Curated annotation (Swiss-Prot), chain A:
Modified positions (N6-acetyllysine) in chain numbering: 31
Record-given protein name: Cytochrome b-c1 complex subunit 8
InterPro entries the record matches: Cyt_bc1_su8 (IPR004205), Cyt_bc1_su8_sf (IPR036642)
PANTHER family hit by this protein: CYTOCHROME B-C1 COMPLEX SUBUNIT 8, UBIQUINOL-CYTOCHROME C REDUCTASE COMPLEX UBIQUINONE-BINDING PROTEIN QP-C
GO biological process, one term: thalamus development
Gene symbol of the encoding locus: UQCRQ
Residues where N6-succinyllysine is found: 31
GO CC annotation: mitochondrial inner membrane; respiratory chain complex III
Taxonomic source organism: Bos taurus
From Swiss-Prot, chain B:
Main location (coarse class): mitochondrion
Record PTM N6-acetyllysine, positions in chain: 8
Residues of the full protein shown: 241 to 360 of 480
Quaternary structure (record): Component of the ubiquinol-cytochrome c oxidoreductase (cytochrome b-c1 complex, complex III, CIII), a multisubunit enzyme composed of 11 subunits. The complex is composed of 3 respiratory subunits cytochrome b, cytochrome c1 and Rieske protein UQCRFS1, 2 core protein subunits UQCRC1/QCR1 and UQCRC2/QCR2, and 6 low-molecular weight protein subunits UQCRH/QCR6, UQCRB/QCR7, UQCRQ/QCR8, UQCR10/QCR9, UQCR11/QCR10 and subunit 9, the cleavage product of Rieske protein UQCRFS1.
Nucleotide-binding is among the record's keywords: no
Protein name as it appears in the record: Cytochrome b-c1 complex subunit 1, mitochondrial
Location in the cell: Mitochondrion inner membrane
Amino acid sequence: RQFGHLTRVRHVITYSLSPFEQRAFPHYFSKGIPNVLRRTRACILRVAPPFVAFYLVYTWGTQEFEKSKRKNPA
Amino acid sequence: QLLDLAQKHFSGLSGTVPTLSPCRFTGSQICHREDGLPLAHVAIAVEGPGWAHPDNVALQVANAIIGHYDCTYGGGAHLSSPLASIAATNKLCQSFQTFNICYADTGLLGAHFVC
């Protein structure tokens, strides 16, 4: 299937502008920083929790290996 | 006699100013996709010079080279315009026209096809 019979669409208007009429980076920081924050707040409670737990299991288990290699008074 | 008649009927007409701002042209696309219609119309144009410019002559020469075509046109494959012979030969379209639309100090120079 190629452009021409992909699907059937009715009543939709697409307006756009030549790249040479426009800025490459419209309001890049003023819109973009807020947007990136928004994006991160959205995902961090899904993504970050596991990696926290990794860091912890790795912290703990690395130091449990430390301790067990030492001597204790007995 | 015309001039007399003009003087007689029109002379009360006021002559005492709306003048025309330049019009900014913009490279752009407007697409009304409506699959339910049976043929597609496309019109495409670059910014043209406007009424006064002497380029309109050379431009109309060029437009005439490229031409106009319609599926009733007898010429078909043997036509002079490559656009037209190719469009006839390969059933690329029903029709097309080149145009040079003229306004004050701007214009639409291009082509419309239905296919």
